[PDB]
Design a protein around this nucleic acid. Structure first.
Lengths: 276, 67
RNA sequence: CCAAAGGCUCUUUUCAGAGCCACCCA
């Protein structure tokens, strides 16, 4: 289409603008003016593309950020057990956090939280001592998603800041609890991978917010708060015109990338996995 | 030692053709150095990141005969 | 010399678009 020709040209034109020039046009068009040079270049390019060009998309996105038992020094051969299971429901149309779920989990092996863990996450020994076991919390999480009608009435996907919440934490937690890894959790959106490709900028939640001109809100390493801050990042990216896509999956208990070359992946409705 | 791989050479040549098949490139050869855009040498050994960058800077440069 | 360059891969949106790996996740 000839209109793309016109876009590629403006793109190059925007590629040569300085930060102030960029900051100027965006202001002029009354758009978000915060963020590093790359964020702005991208923000401005999509404005045009969008303008010069005038769903199959997810209705909701579940942001999940686990906290787990840990130890000082962060050793590689550590057996982590999930202690906080949060979920933040993001309405892609409304672009707002519709609802949230939070529960602490009592670990079966590392029953006693180290001091490092307690100070890092802010989760106390009493909170965990009186919490439920992973399978029980997983049941409650699944019942909560079912009440939201995810997978049935609504098209949705899981989203995480990285690939370890799914590929590592939930993965070994399932092994420890002796249950089969949940099929609804085999594919997901790794917001970091997206963020890097979209804006062209390591990746810490704290760094992604910064390069966006955003301030963190809540207690760091509180599962729910990070999740809520990750949702602020997803909202902003959707608003900057990024089409977040399931980009990673679990196959044979091994992390694999999902091709951006395939139709929008719809996640199955949640179902409590079986033991064994 | 240089680049011998036919598939690499062919891919690079196509990239160069994309640049040469522009009119700014023909405007260039009509008129015309040190700043004058020089075509990347495909037989040279370069990393993928370096080759692509040279091609990107070269193509941008040729439009000095355009916007 | 210079210039280019993290290692790679796809596309005429090629003044341009897209992706994988590495790095990062408590």
């Amino acid at each position: 289409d000839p209109v793309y020709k016109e876009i590629a040209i403006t793109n190059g034109c925007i590629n040569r603008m300085s930060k102030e020039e960029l900051r100027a046009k965006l202001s002029e068009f009354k758009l978000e003016t915060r963020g590093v040079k790359d964020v702005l270049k991208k923000r401005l390019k999509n404005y045009y593309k969008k303008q010069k060009l005038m769903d199959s998309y997810y209705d909701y996105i579940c942001i999940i950020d686990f906290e787990a038992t840990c130890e000082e020094g962060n050793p590689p051969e550590f057996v982590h057990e999930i202690i906080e299971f949060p979920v933040v429901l993001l309405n892609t149309h409304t672009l707002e956090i519709e609802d949230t779920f939070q529960q602490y989990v009592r670990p079966e092996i590392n029953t006693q939280l180290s001091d490092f863990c307690i100070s890092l996450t802010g989760i106390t020994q009493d909170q965990v001592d009186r919490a439920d076991t992973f399978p029980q919390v997983l049941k409650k999480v699944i019942d909560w998603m079912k009440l939201k009608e995810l997978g049935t009435k609504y098209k949705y996907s899981l989203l995480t800041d990285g690939s370890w919440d799914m590929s590592k934490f939930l993965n070994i937690q399932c092994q420890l609890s002796r249950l089969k890894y949940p099929p609804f959790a085999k594919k997901w959106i790794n917001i970091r991978k997206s963020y890097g490709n979209f804006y062209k900028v390591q990746t810490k939640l704290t760094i992604m917010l910064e390069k966006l001109g955003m301030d963190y809100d809540g207690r760091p390493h509180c599962g729910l708060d990070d999740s809520k801050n990750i949702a602020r990042i997803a909202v902003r990216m959707l608003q900057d015109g990024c089409e977040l896509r399931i980009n990673e999956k679990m196959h044979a208990g091994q992390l694999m990338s999902v091709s951006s070359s395939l139709p929008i992946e719809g996640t199955p409705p949640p179902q409590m996995p079986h033991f064994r | 030692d240089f680049e011998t791989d036919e598939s690499v050479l062919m891919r690079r040549q196509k990239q160069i053709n994309y640049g040469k098949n522009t009119i700014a490139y023909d405007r260039y050869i009509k008129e015309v150095p040190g700043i004058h855009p020089k075509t990347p040498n495909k037989f040279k050994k370069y990393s993928r990141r370096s080759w692509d960058q040279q091609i990107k800077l070269w193509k941008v440069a040729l439009h000095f005969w355009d916007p």
